[PDB]
């Protein structure tokens, strides 16, 4: 996923 945002 994304740095801070796993859910992206």
Request: proline residues 29%.
């Amino acid at each position: 996923g994304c740095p801070x945002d796993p859910w992206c």
